[PDB]
Each structure stands twice: as C-alpha cells, then as structure tokens.
Design a protein around this motif. Structure first.
Motif, mmCIF file in Angstrom:
data_model
loop_
_atom_site.group_PDB
_atom_site.id
_atom_site.type_symbol
_atom_site.label_atom_id
_atom_site.label_comp_id
_atom_site.label_asym_id
_atom_site.label_seq_id
_atom_site.Cartn_x
_atom_site.Cartn_y
_atom_site.Cartn_z
ATOM 1 N N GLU A 2 0.823 -1.204 0.000
ATOM 2 C CA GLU A 2 0.000 0.000 0.000
ATOM 3 C C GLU A 2 0.862 1.262 0.000
ATOM 4 O O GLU A 2 2.022 1.238 0.434
ATOM 5 N N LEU A 3 0.271 2.358 -0.477
ATOM 6 C CA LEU A 3 0.937 3.652 -0.561
ATOM 7 C C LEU A 3 1.091 4.338 0.782
ATOM 8 O O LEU A 3 0.158 4.404 1.581
ATOM 9 N N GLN A 4 2.287 4.854 1.022
ATOM 10 C CA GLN A 4 2.597 5.535 2.267
ATOM 11 C C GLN A 4 3.407 6.776 1.938
ATOM 12 O O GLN A 4 4.348 6.713 1.155
ATOM 13 N N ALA A 5 3.057 7.907 2.526
ATOM 14 C CA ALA A 5 3.818 9.105 2.240
ATOM 15 C C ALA A 5 5.060 9.136 3.101
ATOM 16 O O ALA A 5 5.047 8.696 4.253
ATOM 17 N N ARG A 6 6.142 9.650 2.537
ATOM 18 C CA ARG A 6 7.380 9.754 3.281
ATOM 19 C C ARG A 6 7.270 10.859 4.328
ATOM 20 O O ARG A 6 6.404 11.729 4.247
ATOM 21 N N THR A 9 4.279 13.414 8.117
ATOM 22 C CA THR A 9 3.043 13.912 7.529
ATOM 23 C C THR A 9 2.040 14.402 8.558
ATOM 24 O O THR A 9 1.316 15.365 8.317
ATOM 25 N N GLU A 124 13.779 14.627 0.987
ATOM 26 C CA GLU A 124 12.778 14.024 1.835
ATOM 27 C C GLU A 124 13.322 13.239 3.010
ATOM 28 O O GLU A 124 12.719 13.226 4.076
ATOM 29 N N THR A 138 6.323 12.350 -1.325
ATOM 30 C CA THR A 138 6.260 11.329 -2.346
ATOM 31 C C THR A 138 5.563 10.138 -1.713
ATOM 32 O O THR A 138 5.764 9.859 -0.535
ATOM 33 N N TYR A 139 4.749 9.433 -2.485
ATOM 34 C CA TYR A 139 4.049 8.262 -1.962
ATOM 35 C C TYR A 139 4.650 6.970 -2.525
ATOM 36 O O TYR A 139 4.485 6.671 -3.706
ATOM 37 N N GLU A 141 5.321 2.614 -2.290
ATOM 38 C CA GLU A 141 4.533 1.430 -1.950
ATOM 39 C C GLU A 141 5.284 0.614 -0.911
ATOM 40 O O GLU A 141 6.361 0.082 -1.185
#
Ligand SMILES: [Cl-]
Ligand SMILES: [Cl-]
Ligand SMILES: [Cl-]
Ligand SMILES: [Cl-]
Ligand SMILES: [Cl-]
Ligand SMILES: [Cl-]
Ligand SMILES: [Cl-]
Ligand SMILES: [Mg+2]
Ligand SMILES: [Mg+2]
Ligand SMILES: [Mg+2]
Ligand SMILES: [Mg+2]
Ligand SMILES: [Mg+2]
Ligand SMILES: [Mg+2]
Ligand SMILES: [Mg+2]
Ligand SMILES: [Mg+2]
Ligand SMILES: [Mg+2]
Ligand SMILES: [Mg+2]
Ligand SMILES: [Mg+2]
Ligand SMILES: [Mg+2]
Ligand SMILES: [Mg+2]
Ligand SMILES: [Mg+2]
Ligand SMILES: [Mg+2]
Ligand SMILES: [Mg+2]
Ligand code: NA
Ligand code: NA
Ligand code: NA
Ligand code: NA
Ligand code: NA
Ligand code: NA
Ligand code: NA
Ligand code: NA
Ligand code: NA
Ligand code: NA
Ligand code: NA
Ligand code: NA
Ligand code: NA
Ligand code: NA
Ligand code: NA
Ligand code: NA
Lengths: 142, 142, 49, 150
Positions: A2-6, A9, A124, A138-139, A141
């Motif tokens: 799944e997508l996770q933001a660096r 956040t 980042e 940035t997102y 996986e």
RNA sequence: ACCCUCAGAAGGGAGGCGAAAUAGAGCAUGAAAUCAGUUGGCGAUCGAGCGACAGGGCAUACAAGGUCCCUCGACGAAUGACCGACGCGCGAGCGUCCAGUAAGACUCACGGGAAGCCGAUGUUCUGUCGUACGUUUUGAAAAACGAGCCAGGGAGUGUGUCU
RNA sequence: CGCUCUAAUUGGAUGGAAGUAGGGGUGAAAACUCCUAUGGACCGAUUAGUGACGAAAAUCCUGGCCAUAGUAGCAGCGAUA
RNA sequence: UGUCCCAACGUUGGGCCCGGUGAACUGUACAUUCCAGUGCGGAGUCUGGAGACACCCAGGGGGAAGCGAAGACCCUAUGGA
C-alpha cells in the motif's frame, strides 16, 4: 503493498494560544471569492479581479447583491496571514541546503515542483531526520 | 372527494375576507383546510357596488385571459389565493392543501373562526356569495 | 516605414464597416490592424547612453 | 481524423470507421442515434428500409421545417436519408466483415458504439448577385462503429 | 511487408517499425470558441442580468486541504427574561422584587460520533438583494451608442529646449 | 503584482523543463504555489537594469467557429421535353 | 370592358411531402407572455397582477420604437467644395 507518504506527515506545529485563536478565526470567517464583476456572463472575461471602473457599475456603487469590492478591511489577522491551514509557516525548498535553518516545530517545507525524483528522495530523507514535515511528500509502496 | 382536513371551517354568515386571511395563515403553517357552505359566506357593503366590482372582473379579459370564477365555489378560493404567494413552491403547496365547498360534504360541522362571524341582527348592508354568483349568471347548483 | 508602405484608404461611413484604412479589402497601416505600423516602436534616435 | 472515443476489449469486440465522407453530418447524427443498440443485421435491414422509403429516420435535433411521419414513435419529424444510409451500410459491411474474419458472428453482434463527427468542410464558393460571392461548402464526416458480442 | 474487406494504389480491419504513431505525412506541443458520444445534477405546472452572500438535496479514487457533528462542562461583551410575590390601571398592559440573575456570539476541555465524512468542487432547491458591461448624459435597464462567439493583435513614444 | 531581454549573486531539469488540462493551498488583491495527467527540452529566484510590458469594449484588425439551417436558390424567360 | 357592385371556377409554374445539392441576412445576455403601472416622458426583462405543460408543421406579417444606411431635413464647426 500500500501507498505511504514519506516523512512526518502528521506533524503539527505548536502555536501560542493567541495564534491558534487567530488561525481558527481566519478559517471560520473566510472571505468572498472576489472574482471580477460579471466574469460569469462572458467567457472572454476571466475570473481575475479587476477594479470595477464603470461610472454606473452596480458593483462599483456597492449595490447589495453585486459582490464585495476589494478593501483593506478584508485582510486576515497579521499573526496568521500566509499560514498553511495546518498553522505551519511554509518555506520553499529547492535542494538539501535549503533545509538548513528551518525550524521543524514552526515551519514545514514545500519542495518546488521542478525538483526531480532523485533530488526529492534526498531532500525528503534529510528533512524527516531534521524533524521537518514535507507538505508535498512522495508516496511509495510499502 | 375525501380530503383529510386538519381543519373544517364553516363560512356561513362569516366575513369571507376575514375567513380567507385566517385560512391562508393556517395553510402556510402546514394545515390542511376545508371551507364549507361557501354559498352562505357573506361580504359587507352596498350590494349594488359589490356586484359591479365582481361583474367587472368577469368582463375583464383578452386572449391571454383573465379567468374569474362565478360560482361561490371559486370566488372563495380565488380570494384565498390572493392571500398566498401561489406562484412560489411553498405558496402553491399551501393553496393546494386548501379546498372550498358548496354546502358541507363532511359529517362534522365546521368550526367558526374567531372574529369572522357577522351579526344579521345588527347588519343589513351585506350580501351572500351565492347571491353574487346568481347575479353573475352562475348555475344555482346549491 | 514598416506598415506604411501602402495606399490603403478608409471607405468612411456607408457599408456598416468601421472606418479603417483598407486595400484589396484588407485592413492596413493603422496600429490596431494586423500588418499595420508599430505605434510607439524602438527608435534609432534615442540616446541610450 | 478521429480516433475511437471509447475503449473496446479486442477479444469480444469488432471495430470500423468511415473517413472524410462527404455527406450530411446532420443526417449521420440521426442515423447513428437510431441504430445504436441494434444488431448489426437489424441495422442493415433498417437502413435498407430507410433507403427504400418504408422506414423513416427520426430527426430529433435537425428538424426545422421537416414534415411529420406517422411511423415515427415517440416523436414526429423524420426523413429518409439514403446517401448517409448507404455510407452506413458500407460502414456496417466492413465491421461485420472484420468481425467474421476474427471468428465472431458478425450480424448477431450488438452496436455498442456508433457516432459521427464533422471533421471538416470541402470549401466551395457560389457567385451571388451584386458582384459578391458566398460560401458553398460540403461537410466531411468521420464515423466510428464498435461491435460487441451479446 | 503480409493477410481480410472494398468498385478500389481510396478508406477500414488485423498486423509491422520506433522511447513515442494520441510522432503516419500541412505529421513537435495542441488553448478557447465549438462539435459528436457520454457521466453528474436539474427536467415536459412553469418566469427572464444568468449572480453575490446564507443555508439545504444529490454527486465525488488517490494526490496536493483536514477538519466536522452531538451530551455535558469552563469562559461569557452588549443585551437580558418566564414563572411566582406585592402594588397600580376602565383596559390593552405597567411598577417593585425575584435579577443585571437564567440566558447570552466566539473559544476551549472531558466523553461520544462522521471519512462523501468536514472543507472544496459540479449541479440543483430555499432565503435576502439584484432591470449586464463600457460609453454619452443633469438623468442609461433603457425604445441613446458598441459587440454574434473565442483566440491572438490593438493606444503617453523620441529628440531639442524650458521649468 | 505580472510580462521581455541584460548584468551580478545564486538555484532547478530526461529520476522529466516550458506549455496545456483538471484539481489542492496561500494572498484583501494584482497574483504566488503545490498535486495528477499531458508534454519531451529547457526553466527560475534575489538584486540592479531594460521596454514594440498587462484589454471586454474602439460600426477596432486577422483567423477560426456556433446558431441561422438541412432553411433560401437549383420553378418563373413564348425554347414547359 | 371583372376598374367597381362582388366575387367564382379553371389553366400553367411555384407553393406542400420525398432524394440529391446547399448559401446569406442577423445574434450583449436572458427570453412562454398579456394587462396596467413605473422609468431619460414610447419596457418580453423594473413593480403589481393575470396567464402560462414541452416540442414541432403551415400561415399571413401585430410587436421586438424588427433588419438594412455613423440622418439627406435642422442646427453647430473660427469644416470642404
Ligand atoms: Cl494592507
Ligand atoms: Cl378572457
Ligand atoms: Cl407568488
Ligand atoms: Cl346595515
Ligand atoms: Cl453541419
Ligand atoms: Cl476566538
Ligand atoms: Cl500617460
Ligand atoms: Mg468568463
Ligand atoms: Mg508589421
Ligand atoms: Mg417544412
Ligand atoms: Mg457582375
Ligand atoms: Mg501534432
Ligand atoms: Mg411579472
Ligand atoms: Mg439629454
Ligand atoms: Mg492580447
Ligand atoms: Mg542574489
Ligand atoms: Mg475599458
Ligand atoms: Mg470576423
Ligand atoms: Mg427560417
Ligand atoms: Mg411542350
Ligand atoms: Mg449622424
Ligand atoms: Mg441643406
Ligand atoms: Mg468654401
Ligand atoms: Na367588504
Ligand atoms: Na374575466
Ligand atoms: Na507594397
Ligand atoms: Na461589423
Ligand atoms: Na542613439
Ligand atoms: Na430540435
Ligand atoms: Na409519432
Ligand atoms: Na408511431
Ligand atoms: Na450545493
Ligand atoms: Na458614446
Ligand atoms: Na450602460
Ligand atoms: Na428607455
Ligand atoms: Na456572422
Ligand atoms: Na502598448
Ligand atoms: Na379576370
Ligand atoms: Na411581425
């Protein structure tokens, strides 16, 4: 999978009681669209605000129903003006050196769009390690 | 046929205008009203002039039209319509939840609204809607 | 002389047309016309020192 | 020219197009509109009846001055665009042919999509009175067709 | 290229090249006006400067906004009671006390809740105000003048002298 | 506040620039910025300059386009074919 | 002697429906209007009422102070011929 933001956040800034109140006011009062008179009646006329100059303009005359005229009275509180909705003050960043001097408690960083993926990744990761949140992360996986 | 009236008002010997003003007020408050014995409702004044007014209304007209009711039926309903914003959704809703009737097709005897009743013993200059309809040329179907 | 090299004339009133100089039914010379003169263009005479 | 404006699964789909046909763009809309959802075969019979004049094409948008037709259902004005109809039969013949060469049962396929587009005008000039001339142009139509298994 | 289709060196289908054919020939990018098809909202009983501000329906992948709802409680400007007690008035109703109390916008804290859910966006409904714009004019919605729509173009510049 | 080009200082870009489309945030506002898609090579910032620098209008110009409309005409003539 | 009383019938070409071809004028926007009122004293759009289900075909042109032409009349310009 799944997508996770660096980065940080969820990080929130710490504001004085007065600043949080003023921020909450700004968000509650809001302001008018302040779009150009009759922009909606003709396609050649855009939304960008222009002072109504017609001697008979109904807006210019301040007829109720014709929209608000830009005035100093609409300005947002000095103390919060320009703050991201999260309360953070933004700082525009183009590279790693731009991160130096930034207060992660008070400021959040926004990486210019032009910066490439290669340079983003470095910015980042060192941003996060300096305790600074990146507004446009940035997102990946994970 | 069948009208779940929250209220049944008896117009007999009552001042139409006054009644109408109250039936509108209620219909806008969401009440379903039924006015009974319209033919026996009354309007004060010198019969001769009262009649000229309504006869004029009948004569007014053209291609676009000016449909004015002759039966005591319509007369009373139109009167109520004049007290409602019948072209607005709310108003047409109320107007439509109101119906006037010749005689009383219900079992219950309608109620008499306060300050709408006329004392025949102390009043000689007045007229019956039914009298007006007869003069207008209506068909005494009552 | 850019945009002035022509004998374009305006027809004046009468044909439901704006009074713009035209030649061969094509507008010319005036600043607002395509191929017309530059109204206040750069000038060799200007002292830029 | 156009490109297919709709996605189509190649395993259960047959495609076809007409390019720059000089015919009524207005008639084409009407025709497309009418045969969409029909079976390629049904479409063929319909268009042939149109050409024969036993079946009217409802003209729902470009109907000014058009006279009513009894056979039109749910509407009134309609005509018999034979030229555009013939071009559609050409379009269908191709599609059904393409469909067979792929193993499907052409005729039985459903017209999933069919639309006309005005790609341009062959410009023309007509001399008029008083020493003046005015346009006299011809439309150029493109039209996509997508057949799909039932 | 090859194969199918076709009256066919047309066009179309399938296929091949290339990072890319939505680079396929006036072929880089590909805006608006605008057209076809289609999705959301409205819709064949209803009224026209097309909106602004308020508030509701319905609709919404992520991202770049993350807030919002209800119990209670804290604070609480101006303003500010009901009921009850007493005393006036022909009467509608008023006076004194209860009391500057209860209440009172915003904000906050505990607990509970929402993720189409809050903001926002599209559309539509309700409320308030509202007869474009610019120009001419004492007075313009004007039955005064200008524009079909859009894009692009379109108007204080130079030298000398003076102040 | 925004546009062009010059200079000094200083940055971004094929790990995807400008532009464009849709969308998020900021500014009273001119306008600034970010995300996604497209694009496939250039692009900024600060300071000091520069000027053929900002449009809704001129019966404005040039181009493109919609309605008009599948409408008028394709009949009328002493040659009705 | 159909100029008229006073119109009728008929003939040909159109008109109407169908296939094919296929313009222009005109368009600030909105627009189903009618009666009154009001307003720069001649309003589909303001105000009050009345009427008004949507679309389409044919007509004869009442209104849009309809469309066409920066009024020839009149006056004004330290205008022209
Ligand atoms: Cl300020
Ligand atoms: Cl009538
Ligand atoms: Cl009403
Ligand atoms: Cl009496
Ligand atoms: Cl067309
Ligand atoms: Cl506060
Ligand atoms: Cl100036
Ligand atoms: Mg606009
Ligand atoms: Mg030039
Ligand atoms: Mg017709
Ligand atoms: Mg000639
Ligand atoms: Mg290209
Ligand atoms: Mg009205
Ligand atoms: Mg005057
Ligand atoms: Mg421009
Ligand atoms: Mg610097
Ligand atoms: Mg202007
Ligand atoms: Mg033009
Ligand atoms: Mg016509
Ligand atoms: Mg003959
Ligand atoms: Mg004149
Ligand atoms: Mg004279
Ligand atoms: Mg002279
Ligand atoms: Na009376
Ligand atoms: Na009448
Ligand atoms: Na020349
Ligand atoms: Na013109
Ligand atoms: Na010089
Ligand atoms: Na239509
Ligand atoms: Na029918
Ligand atoms: Na039928
Ligand atoms: Na809404
Ligand atoms: Na003027
Ligand atoms: Na005006
Ligand atoms: Na007027
Ligand atoms: Na035109
Ligand atoms: Na300029
Ligand atoms: Na005769
Ligand atoms: Na007329």
């Amino acid at each position: 999978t799944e997508l996770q933001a660096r980065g940080l956040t969820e990080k929130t800034p710490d504001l004085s009681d007065e600043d949080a109140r003023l921020l909450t006011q700004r968000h509650r009062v809001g302001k008018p669209q302040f779009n150009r008179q009759d922009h909606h009646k003709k396609k050649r006329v855009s939304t960008s605000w222009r002072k109504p100059r017609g001697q008979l303009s109904k807006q210019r005359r301040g007829i109720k129903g014709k929209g608000d005229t830009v005035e100093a009275g609409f300005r947002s509180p000095t103390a919060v003006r320009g703050k991201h909705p999260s309360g953070f003050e933004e700082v525009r960043v183009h590279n790693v050196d731009d991160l130096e001097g930034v207060d992660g408690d008070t400021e959040a960083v926004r990486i210019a769009s032009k910066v490439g993926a290669r340079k983003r990744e470095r910015i980042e990761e060192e941003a996060e390690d300096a305790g600074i949140r990146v507004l446009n992360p940035t997102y990946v996986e994970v | 046929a069948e009208f779940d009236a929250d209220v049944i008002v008896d117009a007999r010997d009552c001042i139409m205008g006054r009644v109408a003003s109250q039936v509108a007020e209620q219909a806008l408050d969401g009440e379903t009203v039924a006015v009974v014995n319209a033919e026996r409702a009354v309007i004060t004044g010198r019969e001769e002039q009262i009649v000229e007014k309504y006869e004029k209304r009948v004569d007014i007209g053209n291609d676009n039209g000016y449909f004015y009711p002759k039966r005591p039926d319509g007369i009373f309903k139109r009167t109520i319509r004049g007290m409602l914003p019948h072209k607005k959704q709310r108003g047409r809703e109320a107007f439509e939840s109101v119906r006037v009737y010749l005689g009383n097709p219900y079992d219950e005897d309608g109620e008499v609204l306060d300050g709408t009743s006329l004392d025949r013993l102390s009043n000689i200059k007045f007229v019956t809607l039914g009298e007006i309809s007869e003069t207008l040329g209506a068909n005494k179907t009552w | 002389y850019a945009g002035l090299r022509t004998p374009a004339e305006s027809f004046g009133s009468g044909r439901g047309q704006a009074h713009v100089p035209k030649l061969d039914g094509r507008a010319r010379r005036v600043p607002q016309a395509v191929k017309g003169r530059s109204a206040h263009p750069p000038k060799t005479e200007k002292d830029r020192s | 020219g156009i490109s297919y404006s709709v996605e189509a699964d190649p395993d259960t789909t047959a495609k076809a197009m007409l390019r720059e046909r000089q015919m009524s763009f207005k008639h084409s809309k009407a025709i497309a509109r009418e045969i969409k959802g029909k079976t390629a075969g049904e479409a063929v019979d319909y268009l042939e009846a149109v050409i024969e004049g036993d079946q009217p094409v409802p003209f729902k948008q470009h109907n000014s001055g058009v006279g009513h037709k009894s056979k039109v259902d749910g509407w009134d004005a309609g005509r018999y665009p034979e030229k555009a109809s013939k071009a559609f039969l050409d379009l269908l013949e191709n599609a059904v042919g393409n469909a067979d060469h792929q193993g499907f049962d052409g005729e039985a396929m459903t017209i999933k999509h069919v639309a006309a587009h005005k790609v341009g005008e062959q410009q023309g000039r007509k001399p008029r009175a008083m020493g003046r001339a005015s346009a006299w142009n011809s439309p150029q139509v493109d039209v996509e067709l997508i057949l799909e298994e039932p």
